With several copies, the nearest count.
Chain A
Amino acid sequence: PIVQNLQGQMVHQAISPRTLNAWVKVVEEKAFSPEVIPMFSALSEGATPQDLNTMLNTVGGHQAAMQMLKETINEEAAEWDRLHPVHAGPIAPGQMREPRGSDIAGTTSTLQEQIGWMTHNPPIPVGEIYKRWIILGLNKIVRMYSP
Chain B
Amino acid sequence: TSILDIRQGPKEPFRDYVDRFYKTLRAEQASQEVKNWMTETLLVQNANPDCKTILKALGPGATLEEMMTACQGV
Chain A residues with CB under 8 Å of chain B are 34, 61-64, 66-68, 71, 139-140, 142-144, 146-147
Contact = CB atoms under 8 A, between A and B. Distances in A.
A143 B23 CA distance: 13
Contacts of B15: 64
Contact of A64 (B27, B63, B68): B68
Interface of B: 1-2, 15, 18-27, 29, 63-65, 68-69
Interface residue SS majority, chain A: helix
Interface residue SS majority, chain B: helix
A62 B22 CA distance: 9
Given A34-B26, A143-B29, A146-B1, A63 B19 contact: yes
Contact of A63 (B1, B23, B65, B68): B23
Given A63-B19, A64-B15, A144 B68 contact: yes
Q: Which A-B residue pairs are the 6 nearest by beta carbons?
A: A63-B22, A67-B22, A63-B23, A64-B18, A64-B19, A146-B27
